[PDB]
Amino acid sequence: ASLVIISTLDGRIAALNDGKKQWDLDVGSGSLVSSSLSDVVLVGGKSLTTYGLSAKLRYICSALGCRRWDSDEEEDILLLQRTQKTVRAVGPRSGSEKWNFSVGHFELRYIPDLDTVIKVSVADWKVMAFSRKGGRLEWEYQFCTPIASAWLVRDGKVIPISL
Amino acid sequence: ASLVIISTLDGRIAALNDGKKQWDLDVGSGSLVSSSLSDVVLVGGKSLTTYGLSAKLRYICSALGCRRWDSDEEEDILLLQRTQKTVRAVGPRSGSEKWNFSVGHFELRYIPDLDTVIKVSVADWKVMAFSRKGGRLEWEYQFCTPIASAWLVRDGKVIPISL
């Protein structure tokens, strides 16, 4: 087929003449950004994990190891990794946390086994699909959450659909 | 009092005319270094945690929060943080891990509420205590594991006893 991948602010990945959704899968990492307020010591940690998707969770490889799932079909493959920076501030007196924040993002790689164009209206979080003229609209997908990152995955590679 | 703190390769912290041991406490992080062998994707993550010690675990603050313990006595305080870098290599085909390795270290800060000198023979992992002349030996502590980092904590600060 030929689909579009979308990384949103809530930390969500979605995939789409239509733009219908085929699947939307997330990870236990929450939003791609967070903040708070409640001499200091500061704790933290970045983490680059990796999620093996089909076109489905077959494995999750991280800095500790892998968690796998059953079933088969060979088949297709879609690499997906999550980079989550994180750091809290904490009073040396006692772990009372003055404040905290964290940022994150996804990146995409593909592993293997009639055109129009796509632009993303970040103002209204639209995924717009046009045509040729210039260009005439064909469809658009609206997300109920700010779009962080997006790519175009047709053939078997990954063009990053820019802001 | 007046004591000497020692960070060893196994990821262990120890404290010592004597050099007797008053306490030796560790964390669930294993050795300060590790390695292995079994186009690649690479997972990883650094983590800077913090351990609140007395002179005892009262709290462990990390990038996720705190775990505390009971009892009281005010009292004394000894800040101790662990920085653990870690990264595995993993085949894009499937999380089979081509290899992996990790490094780590501790650093010390003090929070409050007749001399001789100390050198560390890294060759035989000795903690040597001398005197004045020159200098004559008074005692030595031998560790059954390579010494990574060491400090001198007398008054209420931290001089790093060098290699």
Numbering used by the authors:
A (entry chain A), B (entry chain A): 103 to 118, 122 to 143, 191 to 207, 211 to 228, 232 to 271, 306 to 355
Pull text from the paper.
Concurrently, we also expressed and purified mouse PERK luminal domain encompassing residues 101–399 based on the human PERK-optimized construct. The crystal structure of mouse PERK luminal domain exhibits a dimer arrangement (Fig3A and B). The monomer component of the dimer structure is very similar in fold to human PERK with a route mean square deviation (rmsd) value of 1.1 Å when superimposing the two monomer structures together (Fig3C). The only significant difference between the mouse and human monomer is that in the mouse structure, the tetramer subdomain is disordered. The tetramer subdomain is disordered and is not visible within the structure. Superimposition of the mouse PERK dimer with the dimer component of human PERK tetramer structure again reveals a very close match with an rmsd value of 1.0 Å (Fig3D). This indicates that the spatial arrangement of the monomers forming the dimer interface is conserved between PERK species. Furthermore, since the dimer interface is present in both dimer and tetramer structures, this suggests that this is a biologically relevant and stable dimer interface. We found that mouse PERK luminal domain also forms a dimer–tetramer species that exists in a similar ratio (dim3:2tet) to that of human PERK luminal domain protein (Fig5B). In the yeast Ire1 structure, the α2 helix is disordered, similar to mouse PERK structure.
The unfolded protein response is an important cell signaling system that detects the accumulation of misfolded proteins within the endoplasmic reticulum (ER) and carries out a cellular response that attempts to rectify the imbalance. There are three sensor/transducer proteins: Ire1, PERK, and Atf6, that are critical for initiating mammalian UPR cell signaling and give rise to three separate branches of the response. All three proteins have a luminal sensor/transducer domain that in concert with BiP is vital for sensing ER stress, an ER transmembrane region, and a cytosolic domain that propagates the UPR signal (Bertolotti et al, 2000; Schröder & Kaufman, 2005; Ron & Walter, 2007; Zhang & Kaufman, 2008). In an attempt to shed new light upon the mechanism of UPR activation and to rationalize the differences between Ire1 luminal domain structures, we determined the crystal structures of PERK luminal domains in two different states: one state is the previously characterized dimer arrangement as seen with Ire1, and the other state is a novel tetramer arrangement.
